[PDB]
Amino acid sequence: WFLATASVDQTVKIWDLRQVRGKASFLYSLPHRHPVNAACFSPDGARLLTTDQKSEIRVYSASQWDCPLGLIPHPHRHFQHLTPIK
DNA sequence: ATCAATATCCACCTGCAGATTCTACCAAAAGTGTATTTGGAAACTGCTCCATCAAAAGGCATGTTCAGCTGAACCAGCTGAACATGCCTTTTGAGAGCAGTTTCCAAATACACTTTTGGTAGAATCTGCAGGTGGATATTGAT
């Protein structure tokens, strides 16, 4: 009963699907400098991976979603006819 | 020169990718009226410019002379055009950044009046430099 979603708005949002109903009465919001191509949870559940379109990877933790633990810089640049990277 | 090869010129046909033409509108042209300038008629002065003279002097016209240069012939060689080819580099087609508008305002900046005020015209002094004077070198060419 917590959810993750990613968007071209340069933000990635963590929801609580049972509690929220109010059109962005969300739980947490993490910003970025560029768009996001993927936001995938762990198997254990405590580590969120996030992957942008220009050059970055971020790891956010269970503990205080806002601040990141670590950045893994690596270029996976976006392109029209290319399949986006995950 | 003659004949083969072969690119270029030139007739004839079709369709579609760009040319041309219709239509409803909004930024732009134009007519009034006023105010607000501004540049040409009129009238004058004074610096600088146009036609003359006179005593040199330094530059131009003309005339000799010869060292050194500009094509013309010719050619060893090099080096860069013409073709086979295969092979590999260049064309074509299947979402988010950013140029281009729009609001609208905190900040920037023209403009009326005065108050200074450094810059400029013009008189009154400096002195480094155009000349000169002379001696010692440094190129140059003959031999």
UniProtKB/Swiss-Prot annotation:
Sequence motif: DWD box, positions: 1-19
GO CC, any one term = Cul4B-RING E3 ubiquitin ligase complex
Report the protein's function.
Answer: Protein, which is both involved in DNA repair and protein ubiquitination, as part of the UV-DDB complex and DCX (DDB1-CUL4-X-box) complexes, respectively. Core component of the UV-DDB complex (UV-damaged DNA-binding protein complex), a complex that recognizes UV-induced DNA damage and recruit proteins of the nucleotide excision repair pathway (the NER pathway) to initiate DNA repair. The UV-DDB complex preferentially binds to cyclobutane pyrimidine dimers (CPD), 6-4 photoproducts (6-4 PP), apurinic sites and short mismatches.
* WD repeat residue intervals: 1-32, 35-74
Q: What is the effect of changing I14A?
A: Impairs interaction with DDB1
Q: What GO biological process terms are annotated to this protein in UniProt?
A: cellular response to UV; DNA damage response; DNA repair; nucleotide-excision repair; protein autoubiquitination; protein polyubiquitination; pyrimidine dimer repair; response to UV
What is the name listed in the Swiss-Prot or TrEMBL entry for this protein?
DNA damage-binding protein 2
The organism is Homo sapiens (Human)
UniProt note: domains: The DWD box is required for interaction with DDB1.
Quaternary context: Component of the UV-DDB complex which includes DDB1 and DDB2. The UV-DDB complex interacts with monoubiquitinated histone H2A and binds to XPC via the DDB2 subunit. Component of the DCX (DDB1-CUL4-X-box) E3 ubiquitin-protein ligase complex DDB1-CUL4-ROC1 (also known as CUL4-DDB-ROC1 and CUL4-DDB-RBX1), which includes CUL4A or CUL4B, DDB1, DDB2 and RBX1. DDB2 may function as the substrate recognition module within this complex. The DDB1-CUL4-ROC1 complex may associate with the COP9 signalosome, and this inhibits the E3 ubiquitin-protein ligase activity of the complex.
